[PDB]
Each structure stands twice: as structure tokens, then as C-alpha cells.
Amino acid sequence: LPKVSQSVYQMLLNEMVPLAMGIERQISRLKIEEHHTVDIIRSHNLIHELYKADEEEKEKVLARLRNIGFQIGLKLSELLIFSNNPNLKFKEMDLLLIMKFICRDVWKQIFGKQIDNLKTNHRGTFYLLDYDYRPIQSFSLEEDAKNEELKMIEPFLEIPVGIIRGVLSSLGYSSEEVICLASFIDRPTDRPKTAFPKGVSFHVQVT
Amino acid sequence: LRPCFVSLIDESDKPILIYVPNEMNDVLKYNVLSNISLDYFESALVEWHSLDSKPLLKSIFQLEGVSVFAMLIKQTGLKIVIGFEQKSLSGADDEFEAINQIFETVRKIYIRVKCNPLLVSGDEKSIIKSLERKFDELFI
Amino acid sequence: GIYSFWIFDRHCNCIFDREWTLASNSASGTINSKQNEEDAKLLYGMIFSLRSITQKLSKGSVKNDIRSISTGKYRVHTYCTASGLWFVLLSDFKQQSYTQVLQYIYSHIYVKYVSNNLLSPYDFAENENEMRGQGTRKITNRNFISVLESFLAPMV
Amino acid sequence: TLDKFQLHKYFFIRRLRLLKLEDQTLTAFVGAFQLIKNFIESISIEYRKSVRLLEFKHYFITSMLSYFEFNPLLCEIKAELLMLKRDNWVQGVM
């Protein structure tokens, strides 16, 4: 089956927060193609701008990026069901099977590693815990500016939330009974320390 | 093997497409047959596969000179119903496998059209047009 | 093992400085210190001048690049990429060449933690006025310094 | 044709006898309906060009209905079998 280099794919997948800020600014470095000038804005400047622009601007950008992730998950789910063919039913036998399918297949196909353990309250919310979170393994600012790090990577954490929300959609529950939130509250408990210090937790609730 | 009609229905019993590969009022007959077949899925009369996690083809029934098979996609809830003539079936095992293969091609076409990254959110007319031209390309 | 490590870019501006001392791994590592700004421009002048000499008298159809330059005491190991990013390294002799080491640095430290590090910039000369050797925007990425020190710790 | 007809009949009756017993056991009823549906499809599909097919079919269905006579499932099976009988009656008379 055909393949593509993982490096270029990860580079494209990281290149959504600069998209999300730049397109929003366009709705709201001069350069020539062949005869007409087009403005190009450097990618790294847009992450700074998204950090320090506005609360409503940030909310709009995050919603847009969540929509991108939703589309990715919605389109990917059908092909995964056609190929791997899990033992799920349409609406709900139990949410544990659905989340097990997501963990075993979706993260295997998108990222290079199976997502780690997951909590289960057995009635309400599910916590998906991921250690070292591949697409930001080489993301840093400064030796001292550590608190800025967590607050300014936060927009990058929306695309997997969108992916989970989309995969939940087209599988029964729609995007009105499902609320999902990402956070950095995870610790590197006992695994070897990687580049990035903090883990990722996906708090997803359905009803 | 030339199917008489191919019908696609979603979870919510909404027919996407009841295309017939063109007699003028046979569309009514085929659409009635599709409506009749729609209720067989939620019925204890027929035991669905539910084994090894593979879609299974079933000869759901035959009315008025149309042997009609159907497949249920338990994961998504999609429902394919396709009919054939009696005159064009010899009832061999290889024919059954071929019919399963044509069901697989239909499902492939449906998935590939739905995953088009220009469908806005739910514009049904575009889906009908795309599936219709694809089915014209295949069944010809 | 080694004595100091330098990184320049297309814009003739020194991007990284790391100076070592006696063979203790936790040496006097003054990173990006202003006190070595003087003895980096003339190193770049050496490398550019001898590179020009090498290209001028070259033959064939490859446009060769300088590999190493040895003085009486120390020697210089240099690796120049097509993107205009020079990796220089001062070291005592002790062994043939550091081409594999510099290639590994470029292909597993810089490329991983700077180019693929969208938080940080690239082509550090920004908006003119420092494109031609007059400026300082040296990298201070936590992962870059940490991993680089870990990699050069055995060799010193 | 004596090569395959009575062989089919004998195998079918032995199958419906030994495989399932009548009189309750709704799973047995479901499987019996499956068996008769497969058999009637098989005898209709590949004995075509037999001039007495439909005369056989109507009598076969109405005779086989007699066993389902003493719940919603049994009523639904009876209704489906009557529907097949009616459809073949129309296809012959027209």
C-alpha cells in the first residue's frame, strides 16, 4: 500500500496554528508571485501573536482549529471502519468499546505510538492519558521562560481534541452531547524524561 | 450481472439514492421494493452475521421477479439494497461471490464520494450527482 | 577531545557559541557570551577566505568544499551545507576527522530542535539591518543546548 | 428430471425433520423459515424453463404453511409465507 514520509506529514500537521491565526487575521514581508504582490507573514510570529492578541480572538482561532480537527476525524473514521472493521455498533453498546477502538486504531494511524492508559469512571467522563505527545516533542522557548511554554503551546492541543470529537461523531453521539478538553496536568510519572517535560490529558465527557 | 436497482439508506431511514440503470414506471416498482426491504434489518426473522466482524450478504426476500440482496454496516448504520433479475442468475456459488464483490465496489464508491473534501457539510444534491455519475461509469 | 563549537548561517552572523576548558565535562561553558564575539568574526573570516581560495583554484564539476584546517597546535573541523549553515569545531588532533560527528549534529540536533521547532525562528536576521554580520540573535533553545551538551560530553 | 429433483426433495425433508423439531422453540421456527426460504429460492432459480414450476410452487407453499398452525414471530413468518404465495399466484395468473 502507498506510503508518505512521516516528517513532511508531521510538518503539515503542526502547520495549522499558523494557519488558524493567519486566516482569521486575513478575514479581519511583501512578495511577488509573477506580477502581483502577496503578503507573507512568518510562521513563528503567528504563534506569538496568538498568545498575545485577545481572548475573543483566541477563542475564534481555537474554534476554527477544532473544526479542522473535527473534519479530519470525521473523514478518517469511515476509512478506518472500512479497513480495520472494529466490533462496534452504531449508537452505544458501551462507551468503553468506542474509546478502546479510538486508542487502539486512530492514534496508531495518526501518531506513531499507541496512546497510554485511560481512566474510567464507568458512568460519565473518560480520561485519555498520553505521554510525550509526538507532534510537539521539539517545541521550546528558553531555559528560564518555562511558564510561557505551557500557555503558548495550548492552541496546538486542539487538533487531537477535534479528531476525537469527529471520531465520536459519525459513530452515534453527535457534537452536542460530547464535550472534550485537553490539558497539561499530566506528570512524567516514572518513564524516562523526553525533550518536552509535560504530558497530555484528554478529558472527554459524553451523555 | 446487471443489477436492476441499487439503494442506499442511512441510519435515520433517509434514502440517499435509489438509482436505476436506465420502462418509465419501473422506478416506482423498484422504490416500493426498497421501502419494503428497509424494515428487514430490524427484525428477528433474519439472523444477521454478528460473527468475526465482517459484513455479510443476505438474500433478504424475493417479490415480483426481483431477487433482492442487502447488506448492513453495523458500525455506521448504512444499508445497501440491490436487486437482480431471475433471468440473469444461474444460482452458482461464484455468482454469489461476484454479487458480494459488486456490493464491495458500491460501498467503496459511496465511501470515496462521502470523503470528498469539498462536500460542504450535508449538501445532498452534490452527493446524488457524484454517486449518479460514478454509477453510470461503473454500470455501463 | 574538543575546545569550542560554532554555528554560522547564510547571513554571515554567528548563531551559536560554546567554549570548553580542561577535560572535566562540566567545564566553563559560557554559551553565547559577549566575550567571544571578537574571536568569532575573524574565525568566520578565515573560513570564508580559505573557502574562496578553495573554490577559485578548484577543478572538475563539483565545486569542492573545505573539510578541515590544521594549525600548529589545534585544528578546525568544518562542515558547510547547501543552505548556508556552517558547523565549525576547534579540537586537538587525536583522530582523523569529525565529518560524521558534525553530520550527526546537523541531522539530529539542529534539524530536529530548531528547524522543526516552530516556536523558535529560522534565518535569524529579521527585517534587514542585521543580514550582513551585524547582529546577535543567537539560539537559546532549552532542548538544543541540553541535547548538544549531552552529545559532546563524552568527547572532550 | 429424475437426476436432481427427488434428491432435492428427500434432502430437504430430511433436513427440516432432523435439524429442527416443531412445536415451540422459536429459534427452530426462525431456522425453519430460513431453510424454506433458501429451498424455494434454490428450486425457483435453477429449475427455470420448467413449464410446471408455478403450479408446483403454489401447492408447495400452501402445503408447507400447514405446519405453522396450532406469538408475533410465528404470525410474521406466516404473513411472509402468505406474501410469497400471493406473489407467485399473481406471477402465474398474469
Which CATH number does the domain housing residue C137 bear? Answer: 3.30.450.70
Question: Could you tell me if D33 and D80 are in contact, meaning their C-beta atoms sit under 8 angstroms apart?
Answer: yes
Residues belonging to chain D? 94
User: What are the chain D neighbours of B61 within 8 Å (beta carbons)?
Assistant: 37, 80, 84
Question: Could you tell me if C140 and C86 are in contact, meaning their C-beta atoms sit under 8 angstroms apart?
Answer: no
Give resolution, Å, one decimal: 3.7
Interatomic CA distance for residues D37 and D64, integer angstroms: 11
Question: Could you tell me if C11 and C89 are in contact, meaning their C-beta atoms sit under 8 angstroms apart?
Answer: no
Q: CB contact, 8 Å: A78 with chain B? A: yes
Chains that touch C (3 or more CB pairs under 8 A): A
Q: Which residues 26-85 on chain D approach chain B with CB closer than 8 angstroms?
A: 30, 33-34, 37-38, 41-42, 44-46, 48, 73, 76-77, 80, 83-84
Question: Could you tell me if A161 and A16 are in contact, meaning their C-beta atoms sit under 8 angstroms apart?
Answer: no
Q: After which residue numbers is chain C interrupted with C–N beyond 2.5 angstroms?
A: none
Q: How far is CA C123 from CA A49, A99, A114, A182, C107, in A?
A: 19, 43, 36, 33, 17
Interface size, chain B vs chain D, as Cβ–Cβ contacts under 8 Å: 42
* SS3 of residue B75 by DSSP: coil
Q: Domain range holding C144?
A: 1-155
Alpha-carbon Rg for chain A in angstroms = 18
**Could you say which of A138, A142, A152 has the minimum Cβ distance to residue C117?**
A138
Interatomic CA distance for residues A113 and A117, integer angstroms: 12
* Number of domains observed in the structure of chain C: 1
- Show contacts of A82-91: CB within 8 Å, 24+ apart: A82/B107, A82/B108, A82/B111, A85/B53, A85/B54, A85/B55, A85/B75, A86/B53, A86/B75, A87/B53, A88/A171, A88/B74, A88/B75, A89/B74, A89/B75, A90/A171, A90/A172, A90/B11, A90/B74, A90/B75, A90/B76, A90/B77, A91/A172, A91/A173
Under CATH, to which class is B5-138 assigned?
alpha beta
* SS3 of residue C7 by DSSP: strand
Contacts of C58 (CB under 8 A, 6+ apart): C64
Amino acid at the residue A17: V
DSSP A156: G
CA torsion B7→B8→B14→B16, rounded to 10°? -90
Chains that touch A (3 or more CB pairs under 8 A): B, C
Nearest chain B residue to A89 by CA: give it.
Answer: B75
Q: CB contact, 8 Å: A75 with chain B? A: yes
User: What are the chain A neighbours of B74 within 8 Å (beta carbons)?
Assistant: 88-90
Q: Do A79 and B111 touch (CB under 8 A)?
A: yes
CA torsion D28→D29→D35→D36, rounded to 10°? 150
Q: What's the distance, CA D52 to chain centroid? A: 16
Nearest chain B residue to A71 by CA: give it.
Answer: B117
- Sheet strand arrangement including C68-70: C14-19, C4-9, C85-91, C75-80, C68-70
Q: CB contact, 8 Å: C36 with chain A? A: no
Domain ranges in chain B are: 5-138
CA B111, B117, B122, B126 torsion: positive or negative?
Answer: negative
**Could you say which of D30, D48, D91 has the minimum Cβ distance to residue B45?**
D30
